[PDB]
RNA sequence: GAAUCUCUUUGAGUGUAGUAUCUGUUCUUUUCAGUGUAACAACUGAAAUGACCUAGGCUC
């Protein structure tokens, strides 16, 4: 993602199916994390859909997704829209260190 | 006396120029 | 640390998708080849710049100029013209 | 010695600090390891580090800290000897089986990194003696480990290994686990099995025929995982294995017949319509014969085959209602089912998938008797089924009678509930939303129950009472009773002073749903009296109370600005500006969203002074959120009001006020998309001083302004200010730190579209090669980003002449 | 920590400072204009002044400064205080030094407006300087009055023609 | 709720990545070869002593 470096996106050929965001990540561009002015729907590759993993949010990939995810207008102007499948794979160091910090 | 100073700044390094009397210059 | 290590990875990916991307040290030949491919693709792609090249070279058919441009992207195409 | 024994001391002190140490201590020692990892011997790093992870005294907290160090070292050193490979697999391998998926993933990143580090040849040499092990646990582990390696390096490179283990006549356990590897490979790759499935199939088929049963079962599960993960495509391959499944089903019975019916059942939906009808009808007989099986496994498989076969077009819904359905509901809805969850999920989901073929009124018809049963946890499951079924099929099928009995049972089972669950709310709500106009004659008692439940002494029943109102308010409008809206709203506004926050938030949410729906003037309390009773609630702390209160106040800000006097609005602003210290996000986002509503309500200049007074605070959350607030105010009330005040505020000598000014300007630029053009011209002398200033934060943050400004101001025709801005930026290319450099690069990329590709390139081509290995390393990055944004857009702009490069292009010099 | 002293901003265009170096730039942070150092807190500043590099810069500034930078006559009778204020200062600090006179050209003045004549300036430590215009190119400029005795004091002018009645505090000059 | 009396006032959170900036301590001589650097630098291994003359040596 933008703010967290250890995350690794997918970047494959986007399929025909739209990604989904959890209520918590709702209304955010998967690239720059901008809450404002959405533009288009995201699209994810086959290997990012398949089973239950398709229902998860495409940013945090933990909670279940509900709303379709949108690219903000700027990321569509820059063209970072069409790079590929913008699905985060690994969970990152922050979330894990939170989980084990609490218990 | 400022030992490290000339090595930083590049001075006290022997150098030569052919066109003026093959003159020597101590810094770049 | 980890950020740069992502930079290398996205470098490897974009260099795969978009073909030529200079990294740090790229030979003049390696880069000039990319320039050649881009230029030829522009000449063939737009029907405008294809009309212009076709009429200027006076070839008998558009497709001859287009295939000439495609063939020109391979290095051995020069020598191939010389053996005719 | 004594010099290098000091190193032996440094690694011990570090590792100690990471495992047991202060936060700021371990945080720096991690950096020291990552930067110094190359100069310490990996023999010493792993030789010292690994013995810690073996003891039993380590907590999960202290274990993950060591794991992270292992990962950071492995990803760096890049080359490792085989003994340490085996050791790291001994430590990391057990993680894939751990109870929670977090440890699974972090133990998976290890093996997927080591697979690249240690290479293909070494790990396979490590696994070969391990698969033959007599132990069950080790084999279970390195099945999963082997699959992780398989996905990591690609499956084809590791495939003949699997073929060797599977087809090995030497050892039996080698065949067993060699087959399990196909399981977890099928799981990890997901749909991506596909093309590899043929090669994988070389293993399974013959490995299915072993005389030993526990291998015959494992192959049967592999066929199920491959069959489901594939989906319709994989049929053409499984035809070879399709025959022996039938000679296995008709005989072996016991626990094996369960596995083979799982396999064939998972093979059904990918079969052609011709065969599907046959194989289904063959399976249904065995299904009916096996209804009475006490084994959990066999019931689980039966629910799978019924689960899949409903999708088959061959069987008619009449065939299901006449025969299979009544035998289903009576057997699998026994109250003993409702006690164990994993089988509950399968029974409910099976009923839901049968609801498609079956009539909605028929499925719901059979589901009313479990609703009216006395058992509570059984009524809950009976609710789940109705919820999901109604969600799929809608209520259009229901006759008035079932429509009455359903809602009756939902009221009853609603009022005795114990555990906190939304399944009633959604479900009892999913009913309402669907049939809402048809709901009217039932609405009077329902509300009464709520009005009783609000007075109940238990906090949960009060939560659940208030929550169900918020769902009914839209359908209550559709049922047109406004007097009930007012009576509710009054009773809630009276109950609004409750002690328990968790209930109070829900109460305020119901208030919200009432206020948004109903006519503003007809509200009884009314709003003008409502809000001054809300302002003390914002200090209730907790969260949900704050969230719901803020969203409600914002609803008033949209709908009813003119009621509360502007001084009271200023009290609101002073409470929110204090309130956004909250740790939660949505609290802050909602607060910032409300400043637009208030600034629209009363005025910009009374809010702006209050906000700018808050940028002098040290904490970062406060400054950033006030920056976003200034951005939203500038959007809603217009930039020409906020811009001169902010530009005046930037004159203050304090650092944090200046950075806050630049950031608020970033937000107010990305919020107004097009406008942005009239306003530049003023702010370039403001960016003039920002891009010049010494510290690296101003140069960072100001470039972020240049991104949002240049992207959506491009093509407007200014372009003489963006050349200025660029001329100020270019020298910053050499700057280090991650944050400034990414913002600067984004800035140059935005300026590329304001200036154009060529006018932007004229700066870069110079040092694009260059002697210095650094200037080169810096410019090739900007040329990379420009090349990604523009390929055929830079073609006229290359610096190439016939004598500049060997070949050039002879056709660019032609003229007609 | 700051000892309550106001450290002015760099741009405020100069109340005497304690150390005439540490400022606050246009931004918030603290600066040492010699060493060109940015300090976050006043403690770090006190460590800079107590540091070795600042001393080196102070000395280098010291060297940098130390390398660059039968006729008619008139008689004046200047009177001084009557033990009114000189009762608080008696620490043999140049107290033995008598008033001094010098001839100054008006070519240099704080205002630099008009000029072209000389002044017979007379100075004493506490009291304020005094001047007397001398239009005549030369008056009483004698020729070897005494018999060439060499105690230059300050100059030929002072020894040649001045008297300091220190007991009564009366300075005569002619 | 109402009635009376006295006195007073007014008129220290938290975690994940990452920068920036000060202080303290060392500067081994000298040559050659390798690494490295845009050039330096830095890193790696080997060894200058005796004599003479008016800064220098076709010096031994
Ligand atoms: Zn993907
Ligand atoms: Zn999410
Ligand atoms: Zn975006
Ligand atoms: Zn010269
Ligand atoms: Zn200083």
UniProtKB/Swiss-Prot annotation, chain A:
Keywords: mRNA processing, mRNA splicing, Nucleus, Spliceosome. Pfam families: PHF5. InterPro entries: PHF5 (IPR005345). Its main location: nucleus. It is found in: Nucleus. The keyword Cell division does not apply. One of its GO terms (cellular component) is spliceosomal complex. Disulfide bonds: none annotated. GO terms for biological process: mRNA splicing, via spliceosome; response to xenobiotic stimulus; spliceosomal complex assembly; U2-type prespliceosome assembly. Belongs to the PHF5 family. PANTHER family: PHD FINGER-LIKE DOMAIN-CONTAINING PROTEIN 5A. Required for pre-mRNA splicing. Involved in regulation of drug sensitivity and may play a role in multidrug resistance. Component of the spliceosome where it interacts with CUS1, HSH49, HSH155, IST3 and RSE1. Also interacts with YRA1. This is Pre-mRNA-splicing factor RDS3.
Curated annotation (Swiss-Prot), chain B:
It comes from the Eukaryota. It is found in: Nucleus. mRNA splicing factors, PRP9, PRP11, and PRP21, are necessary for binding of the U2 snRNP to the pre-mRNA in an early step of spliceosome assembly. Belongs to the SF3A3 family. Belongs to the CWC complex (or CEF1-associated complex), a spliceosome sub-complex reminiscent of a late-stage spliceosome composed of the U2, U5 and U6 snRNAs and at least BUD13, BUD31, BRR2, CDC40, CEF1, CLF1, CUS1, CWC2, CWC15, CWC21, CWC22, CWC23, CWC24, CWC25, CWC27, ECM2, HSH155, IST3, ISY1, LEA1, MSL1, NTC20, PRP8, PRP9, PRP11, PRP19, PRP21, PRP22, PRP45, PRP46, SLU7, SMB1, SMD1, SMD2, SMD3, SMX2, SMX3, SNT309, SNU114, SPP2, SYF1, SYF2, RSE1 and YJU2. Present with 3920 molecules/cell in log phase SD medium. This is Pre-mRNA-splicing factor PRP9. It comes from Saccharomyces cerevisiae (strain ATCC 204508 / S288c) (Baker's yeast). The lineage of its organism: Eukaryota, Fungi, Dikarya, Ascomycota, Saccharomycotina. The chain holds residues 407 to 434 of 530 of the full protein.
Curated annotation (Swiss-Prot), chain C:
It is found in: Nucleus. Keywords: mRNA processing, mRNA splicing, Nucleus. GO terms for biological process: mRNA splicing, via spliceosome; spliceosomal complex assembly; U2-type prespliceosome assembly. The keyword Nucleus applies. Its main location: nucleus. Involved in pre-mRNA splicing. Required for the SF3b integrity and prespliceosome assembly. This is RDS3 complex subunit 10.
Swiss-Prot record, chain E:
GO terms for biological process: mRNA splicing, via spliceosome; spliceosomal complex assembly; U2-type prespliceosome assembly. A zinc finger (Matrin-type) spans 30-60. It comes from the Eukaryota. It is found in: Nucleus. One of its GO terms (cellular component) is U2 snRNP. GO terms for molecular function: RNA binding; zinc ion binding. Transmembrane segments: none annotated. Keywords: Metal-binding, mRNA processing, mRNA splicing, Nucleus, Spliceosome, Zinc, Zinc-finger. Belongs to the SF3A2 family. Belongs to the CWC complex (or CEF1-associated complex), a spliceosome sub-complex reminiscent of a late-stage spliceosome composed of the U2, U5 and U6 snRNAs and at least BUD13, BUD31, BRR2, CDC40, CEF1, CLF1, CUS1, CWC2, CWC15, CWC21, CWC22, CWC23, CWC24, CWC25, CWC27, ECM2, HSH155, IST3, ISY1, LEA1, MSL1, NTC20, PRP8, PRP9, PRP11, PRP19, PRP21, PRP22, PRP45, PRP46, SLU7, SMB1, SMD1, SMD2, SMD3, SMX2, SMX3, SNT309, SNU114, SPP2, SYF1, SYF2, RSE1 and YJU2. Interacts with CUS2. Present with 3460 molecules/cell in log phase SD medium. mRNA splicing factors, PRP9, PRP11, and PRP21, are necessary for addition of the U2 snRNP to the pre-mRNA in an early step of spliceosome assembly. This is Pre-mRNA-splicing factor PRP11. It comes from Saccharomyces cerevisiae (strain ATCC 204508 / S288c). The gene is PRP11. The chain holds residues 34 to 253 of 266 of the full protein.
